[PDB]
Amino acid sequence: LAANLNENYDTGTLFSKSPMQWDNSSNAGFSEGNHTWLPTSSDYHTVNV
Ligand SMILES: *[C@@H]1O[C@H](CO)[C@@H](O)[C@H](O)[C@H]1NC(C)=O
Ligand SMILES: *[C@@H]1O[C@H](CO)[C@@H](O)[C@H](O)[C@H]1NC(C)=O
């Protein structure tokens, strides 16, 4: 629904590049880090691999 990126990206088509949701973890299991370049969708607890 929204993201705050400090790079030059096309905000009209940026929201369809969210990180892949693998499981229930930190950042849907995509990064295992502190932050991701883009926020994962909020409902990654129900829809993930
Ligand atoms: C996420 O999935 C795991 C199964 O791998 C489950 O044990 C856990 O309770 C789930 N978390 C939520 C918030 O649904
Ligand atoms: C994320 O924050 C925690 C808080 O202490 C820190 O330990 C960790 O190093 C941070 N992650 C990265 C990638 O720096």
d(CA 8, CA 27): 23
23: which 2 tokens? 């499981």
Helix, strand, coil shares of the chain as percentages rounded to 5?
A: 10, 0, 90
Which structural technique was applied?
Answer: cryo-EM
- Which residue, by CA, sits nearest to atom 8 of ligand 2? 34
Least distant ligand from the CA of 49? 1
Neighbours of 27 (CB within 10 A): 18
Q: 27: helix, coil or strand?
A: helix
Residues with CB under 6 A from ligand 1: 23-24, 45
Neighbours of 39 (CB within 10 A): 16
What's the number of CA atoms in the CB half-sphere (13 Å) around residue 1?
Answer: 3
Experimental structure resolution, Å = 2.8
Contact present, 18 and 9 (Cβ < 8 Å): no
Contact present, 28 and 49 (Cβ < 8 Å): no
| Residue where the block lists tokens 């096309």 | 10
